[PDB]
Design an enzyme around this catalytic site. Structure first.
Site, short mmCIF file in Angstrom:
data_model
loop_
_atom_site.label_atom_id
_atom_site.label_comp_id
_atom_site.label_asym_id
_atom_site.label_seq_id
_atom_site.Cartn_x
_atom_site.Cartn_y
_atom_site.Cartn_z
N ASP A 161 112.66 10.32 15.82
CA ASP A 161 112.58 10.26 17.27
C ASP A 161 111.86 11.48 17.74
O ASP A 161 112.37 12.58 17.37
CB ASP A 161 113.90 9.87 17.96
CG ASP A 161 114.29 8.50 18.28
OD1 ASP A 161 113.42 7.69 18.08
OD2 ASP A 161 115.37 8.32 19.23
N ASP A 204 109.41 7.32 22.02
CA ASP A 204 109.59 8.23 20.90
C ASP A 204 109.70 7.76 19.71
O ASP A 204 110.51 8.19 18.76
CB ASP A 204 110.77 9.21 21.17
CG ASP A 204 110.51 9.99 22.49
OD1 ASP A 204 109.44 9.63 23.45
OD2 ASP A 204 111.30 10.79 22.86
N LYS A 250 129.73 4.65 13.16
CA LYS A 250 130.32 5.56 12.09
C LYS A 250 131.24 5.01 11.03
O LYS A 250 132.52 5.28 11.02
CB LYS A 250 131.11 6.73 12.73
CG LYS A 250 130.48 7.38 14.02
CD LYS A 250 129.28 8.23 13.32
CE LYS A 250 128.42 8.87 14.44
NZ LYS A 250 127.25 9.64 13.68
#
Lengths: 364, 364
Positions: A216, A112, A164
């Site tokens: 994606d 993808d 993160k």
């Protein structure tokens, strides 16, 4: 002795459900080609010989005989990856055994990913590198939303992976296109992201910054957005005053760039909107509006309908004066009567529709 | 030379969708057997040799090799009926060519009929009849709602077919189980069903009144209703104080009659409600409530859940303390977390559920 590659396609296709029941997720058409044929074509542009397809489930899902592209292009698929339940290491589990005396680093790709696909990576990053082009990165505006920031300092080397991060280390994100050397293969029974932390620990992991688009394609919304980002990048690639395709069956106008299959019949006064794709043998009525939408394979479309930001099935037969808009995917061999308004409703294959739907939902 | 029969299965299975994607509509299990196995067993009770299956679409839908039942029971399926687009005359189109020198009248049956199946029809109505047992009828309370009333006078002969009759001619309704003689076959290119108006015109069409139950299993609601009507009729048929099945893996209680597969494990304190079916290798938790529900093939069920008037998939894995009620069908290989409440929601195969749904709907 020729260069080889591995493609990780193992999955269920659950997210892109309404049109993946008929055909497997890898071979759902994008623009005018199956989603993987772009990657085989890019790898051929590199000069590879054969591709190692890694399917998690249903290896013989009719894909072998459906792969008519295998005989052409001089590329042979082996389908040698059948996976028992193990960790997320395709090459480590099955493809480790099959190497057949490689001599050059082998590419690793997702299923993808849609990019300009810079295919000089075999030659690039060759300045005395161990595991050349170990990772590929692209710029993202939301540094913290997506997370998993691959920090790229001035030197083309990565040493830390932070998930993160609070600090603005960088905007680079792992594209998912990998190339590793043969010596990378080590028997690791189920596994930490394919030994990336250690790979950085010895400091032989390099990153390639990408200027092109990246995303994606896992959802119909992402499908449409990938189309609208990818169509302008094909101006120098394929054959198709806005002259992407102007006169096919009649004097019709196209507002923006679009892909019109040569065998299709557009009609007489249609208006093919910006960033639209139409498959072979498709028939479009006398006046239509195909705005940012895809029409796949043999489909018939009546007069005056509007298809906006949506998709249609393979053998779908669309009514005359209907109105299909928003993110709505129509399955295979669907039919809609005249004057229906489907707004963001995914219909299952072989169904029939005859009623309005003004709210998002599913027709079984 | 042996007796043969034709089964009309041509269809799409669209109505019974959420669990027909994995396996074709004819071979979705009912109670403990595939829906065609009951038909084949009854036809064997007659003493037939081979069955002519008339499938409209996808003749090789993996049914041939999945029909393991063909080698057993001494009944051979030929699958010789592939249908081009024509009228609703199966035997007239394809099965007319194949008769293999028959000598006795051949049965014609639907695929969604559930009855006591009186298999004396070959011997019954033999008192000098031309086209014995031409039609089969059953009593219905709603004489005008269903329509298509087959009027049966005192003589066992039918002469008129009236659709939505105003007069209370009778409560008989065409069951859909037909038997015709070899001479009936006449080349009629596309077709009043089986030329029934003419069949009455020469006055050799007879009707057999049925005292047993009859309903079309075409929907999950009709599936549940057919199960709750059919279970009591099996008291003399199969192996299974209410002693239909009482002690399998522990001391549990069954309120009413139910079908418990011998290989299944019930648990310790379950309460198998009235008219429930359980497939092989199914595992039921320590305390459960299977109330008027069907569990198909290898499934695991936690502790304290309630499955009321619902169906579950083939390899379904159900949570511990969930609550599944109303007409909700779960596809193949679905999984639900602990403490979920699915009320009349149909989930697609391979999906995962972790959130409540208090309203009817569909999960993709």
């Amino acid at each position: 002795q020729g260069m080889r590659a591995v493609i990780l396609v193992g999955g269920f296709g659950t997210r892109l459900r309404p049109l993946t029941l008929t055909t497997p997720k890898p071979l759902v058409p994008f623009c005018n080609k199956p989603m993987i044929i772009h990657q085989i074509e890019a790898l051929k542009a590199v000069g590879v010989t054969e591709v190692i397809l890694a399917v998690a489930y249903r290896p013989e899902a009719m894909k072998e005989q459906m792969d008519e592209w295998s005989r052409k292009l001089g590329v042979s698929f082996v389908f040698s990856v059948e996976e028992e339940p193990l960790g997320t290491a395709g090459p480590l589990a099955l493809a480790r055994d099959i190497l057949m005396q490689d001599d050059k680093p082998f590419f690793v790709l997702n299923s993808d990913v849609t990019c300009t696909f810079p295919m000089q990576e075999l030659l690039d990053f060759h300045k005395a590198h161990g595991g050349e082009g170990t990772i590929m990165v692209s710029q993202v505006t939301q540094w913290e939303k997506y997370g998993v920031v691959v920090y790229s300092p001035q030197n083309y080397q990565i040493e830390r992976f932070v998930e993160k991060p609070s600090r603005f280390l960088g905007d680079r994100i792992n594209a998912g296109i990998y190339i590793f050397n043969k010596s990378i293969l080590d028997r690791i029974p189920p596994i930490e992201k394919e030994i990336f932390p250690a790979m950085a620990a010895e400091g032989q992991l390099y990153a390639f910054n990408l200027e092109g688009f990246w995303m994606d394609v896992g959802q119909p919304k992402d499908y449409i957005l990938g189309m609208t980002k990818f169509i302008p990048s094909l101006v120098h690639g394929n054959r198709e005053t806005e002259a992407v395709e102007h006169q096919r069956g009649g004097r019709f106008t196209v507002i923006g760039a679009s892909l019109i299959d040569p065998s299709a019949k557009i009609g007489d006064g249609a208006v093919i909107g910006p960033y639209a794709s139409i498959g072979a043998n498709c028939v479009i009525g006398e006046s239509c509006r195909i705005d940012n939408a895809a029409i796949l394979e043999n489909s018939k479309v009546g007069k005056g309908t509007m298809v906006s930001r949506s998709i249609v099935g393979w053998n779908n037969r669309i009514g005359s004066w209907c109105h299909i808009k928003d993110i709505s995917v129509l399955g295979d061999d669907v039919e809609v009567k005249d004057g229906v308004i489907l707004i963001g409703t995914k219909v299952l294959p072989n169904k029939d529709v005859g009623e309005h739907r003004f709210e998002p939902g599913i027709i079984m």
